[PDB]
């Protein structure tokens, strides 16, 4: 099923997700629902916190043909290097983009949808998306890196959009 994506101001977006206990059928259904939601919202990443599920689960797909499913369950940053940034969007912050500092490369470990551990070295867009999604699981948003005024501006714009929807 396609799930409801929370938007700021929503305080739930500020929650810190708990680690996943076992990767069972129930976890796998959450993963599958999260992909469905992500794809439907035309997104490249989604964290469980965004759909009010506070467990360390991320889904990502940075491909055009939407057939490269990356699942990060209980992800762990093992190393990062360099610096970069692009103008990032966020399904929890509709229609607002801003450039945000990020590591250029990350190396992470996580469990996949079967519960298998794997390591992944990423760079470019995928590194940035991974960092953005991992920020979600500790209640952090791309807005947090901007000036207090810019946070208020953005948060004002979002509240106006949800009034009209
Ligand atoms: Ni986001």
From Swiss-Prot:
Pfam families cross-referenced by the UniProt entry: Pep_deformylase
Domain of life: Bacteria
Its EC number(s): 3.5.1.88
SUPFAM superfamilies: Peptide deformylase
GO annotation terms (biological process): co-translational protein modification; translation
Catalysed reaction, written as an equation: N-terminal N-formyl-L-methionyl-[peptide] + H2O = N-terminal L-methionyl-[peptide] + formate
First-level EC class: hydrolase
Active site (UniProt): 133
Cofactor annotation: Fe(2+); Zn(2+)
Function (record text): Removes the formyl group from the N-terminal Met of newly synthesized proteins. Requires at least a dipeptide for an efficient rate of reaction. N-terminal L-methionine is a prerequisite for activity but the enzyme has broad specificity at other positions.
The protein's name in its UniProt record: Peptide deformylase
GO cellular component: cytosol
Stated family: Belongs to the polypeptide deformylase family.
Cofactor note: Upon overproduction is isolated with 1 Fe(2+) ion per monomer, a Ni(2+)-bound form is as active while a Zn(2+)-bound form is inactive.
UniProt activity-regulation remark: Inhibited by 1,10-phenanthroline.
Subunit description: Monomer.
Residues holding Fe cation: 90, 132, 136
Annotated PANTHER family: PEPTIDE DEFORMYLASE
Keyword annotations: Hydrolase, Iron, Metal-binding, Protein biosynthesis, Zinc
GO molecular function terms noted in the UniProt entry: ferrous iron binding; hydrolase activity; peptide deformylase activity; ribosome binding; zinc ion binding
Keyword presence, Transmembrane helix: no
């Amino acid at each position: 099923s396609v799930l409801q994506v929370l938007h700021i101001p929503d305080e739930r977006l500020r929650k810190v997700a708990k680690p996943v206990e076992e990767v069972n059928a129930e976890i796998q259904r959450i993963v599958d629902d999260m992909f469905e939601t992500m794809y439907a919202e035309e997104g490249i990443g989604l964290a469980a916190t965004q759909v009010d599920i506070h467990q360390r689960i991320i889904v990502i797909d940075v491909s055009e043909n939407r057939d490269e499913r990356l699942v990060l369950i209980n992800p762990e940053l093992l190393e990062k290097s360099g610096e970069t940034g692009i103008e990032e969007g966020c399904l929890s912050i509709p229609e607002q983009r801003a450039l945000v500092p990020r590591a250029e490369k990350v190396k992470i470990r996580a469990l996949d949808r079967d519960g298998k551990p794997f390591e992944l070295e990423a760079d470019g867009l995928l590194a940035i998306c991974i960092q953005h999604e991992m920020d979600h699981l500790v209640g952090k948003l791309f807005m947090d890196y901007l000036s207090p005024l810019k946070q208020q501006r953005i948060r004002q714009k979002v509240e106006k959009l949800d009034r009209l929807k």
